[PDB]
């Protein structure tokens, strides 16, 4: 897609080894935030979005937290509290041909900078302080988009780079998506180390009368530690308490 009306695709109810991506040589730029790429496979996520678009090469610097500019002001922007990853690679072999291939467009005028993740498909004409512009375009009243052209001879800094951002939140259960790992039989009453699609810790796991309502998928104590959880393989309520300890 164009960066104007960049294409969100949701990724859900699935498993994926992320590293199958970046171990291939093609992905010229890659940077994650709030998580480390090589360890992504250990985590699970509430929900995932892949936001996909093409932008001019020297613009890719702007697809990052905080940084801003004529693309990030008006076409797509990422929050300050971002977590996720940004990926982009050269596409002058693909979205570019001898005469230029003008199908790719971007918004260049807007009345205000975007909120984060705002998609604004509005083609409406931008009036820079005019009386009502009737929908003609002219003296100080502009159409807001422009094309890139991307002719193959064009200098590489302006050649098109295809971008994908993955956005995902690492808050605990439910989690429609996980990185792969095989899994164990359960054990209870004895002292164990545990995880639950994340939710790592240690304790004794006990059956409990704790009356979780059907939607509740992990549970916390008055100390705000995780204190009870549901087994994601079987929906049983497991009640945690730490293993016995003290001063000697």
């Amino acid at each position, epitope marked *: 897609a164009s960066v104007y009306a960049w294409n969100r695709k949701r990724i859900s109810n699935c498993v994926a080894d992320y590293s199958v991506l970046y171990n291939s040589a093609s992905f010229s730029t890659f940077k994650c935030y709030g998580v480390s790429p090589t360890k992504l496979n250990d985590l699970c996520f509430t929900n995932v979005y892949a936001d996909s678009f093409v932008i001019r090469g020297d613009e890719v610097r702007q697809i990052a937290p905080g940084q801003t500019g*004529k693309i990030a002001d008006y076409n797509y922007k990422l929050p300050d509290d971002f977590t996720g990853c940004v990926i982009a690679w050269n596409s002058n072999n693909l979205d570019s041909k001898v*005469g*230029g*291939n*003008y*199908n790719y*467009l971007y918004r*260049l*005028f807007r009345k205000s900078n975007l909120k984060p993740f705002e998609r604004d498909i509005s*083609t409406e004409i931008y009036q820079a302080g005019s009386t009502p512009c009737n929908g*003609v*375009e*002219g*003296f*100080n009243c*502009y*159409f807001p*988009l*422009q*094309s890139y*052209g991307f*002719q193959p001879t064009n200098g590489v800094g302006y050649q098109p780079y295809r971008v994908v951002v993955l956005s995902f939140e690492l808050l605990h259960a439910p989690a429609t998506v996980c990185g792969p790992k095989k899994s164990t039989n359960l054990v209870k009453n004895k002292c164990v180390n545990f995880n639950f699609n994340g939710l790592t810790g240690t304790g004794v796991l006990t059956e409990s009368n704790k009356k979780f309502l059907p939607f509740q998928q992990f549970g916390r104590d008055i100390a705000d530690t995780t204190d009870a959880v549901r087994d994601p393989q079987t929906l049983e309520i497991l009640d945690i308490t730490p293993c016995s300890f003290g001063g000697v």
Partner: antibody, heavy 129, light 110 residues
Framework: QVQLVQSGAEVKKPGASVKVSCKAS????????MHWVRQAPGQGLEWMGW????????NYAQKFQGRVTMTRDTSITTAYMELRRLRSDDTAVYYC??????????????????????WGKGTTVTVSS | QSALTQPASVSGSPGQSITISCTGT?????????VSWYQQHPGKAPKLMIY???KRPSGVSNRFSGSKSGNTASLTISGLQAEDEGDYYC??????????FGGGTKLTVL
């Protein structure tokens, strides 16, 4: 170098309709508005109106808003004009020309060029019986 | 749309310098003030001889100079020479975001 290549000469009897084409080359098609201009032999060479490759949509004068249409085939870097009439007066040379365009310049962006820099050789419509 | 006022032909300038008026109405020359002048030699498509009201494009001889506002615009020629003569068409930017053009005038070196 930048150039326009208008389509060849054409003919159309009275009350028909006619269309002409203008390919553009050595050039960036979406940089600039396509203007048209024309006139009969020895007339004012003063026709005016334009189409925007970035956008579609058009503007053309009060004697013609309702009598002309303009099109683009952007992957083919080409613009078209058609006149839905064949008035006896409509004859002789029609030219296509690179006109208005964006010229964003440091911080500010704006429309910049307002003078139609380069013109095709045009074509003669011969629009009469 | 009404064409811009433009007198018939230059005279009193067998070489040297003389000016063509382009006296338009307020919604064109007095408004946005982007007037331009183009020369249309026989058959060939006209050249963009003056870009904004006072000033030259590249490849224009340093004799031609556009002028004025308050009154509507004019082009002042200089050093007129037997290759340069042709016909000059004024053009202007109108209120309605279309341009409008002048009726032309014909040069006449001796």
């Amino acid at each position: 170098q930048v150039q326009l290549v208008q389509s060849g000469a054409e003919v159309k009897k009275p009350g028909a309709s006619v269309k002409v084409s203008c390919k553009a080359s050595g050039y960036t098609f979406t940089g600039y508005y396509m203007h048209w201009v024309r006139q009969a032999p020895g007339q004012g060479l003063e026709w005016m109106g334009w189409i925007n490759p970035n956008s579609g949509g058009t503007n053309y004068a009060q004697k013609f808003q309702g009598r002309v249409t303009m099109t683009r085939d952007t992957s083919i870097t080409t613009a078209y004009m058609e006149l839905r009439r064949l008035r006896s007066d409509d004859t002789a040379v029609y030219y296509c020309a690179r006109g208005l365009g964006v010229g964003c310049s440091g911080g500010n962006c704006y429309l910049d060029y307002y003078y139609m820099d380069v013109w095709g050789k045009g074509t003669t419509v011969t629009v009469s019986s | 749309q009404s064409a811009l006022t433009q007198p018939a032909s230059v005279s009193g300038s067998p070489g040297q310098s003389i000016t063509i008026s382009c006296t338009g109405t307020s919604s064109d020359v007095g408004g946005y003030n982007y007037v331009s002048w183009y020369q249309q030699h026989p058959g060939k498509a006209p050249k963009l001889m003056i870009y904004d009201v006072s000033k030259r494009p590249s490849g224009v001889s340093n004799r031609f100079s556009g002028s004025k506002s308050g009154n509507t615009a004019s082009l002042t020629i200089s050093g007129l020479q037997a290759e340069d003569e042709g016909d000059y068409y004024c053009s202007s930017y109108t209120s309605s975001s279309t341009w409008v053009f002048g009726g032309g005038t014909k040069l006449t070196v001796l």
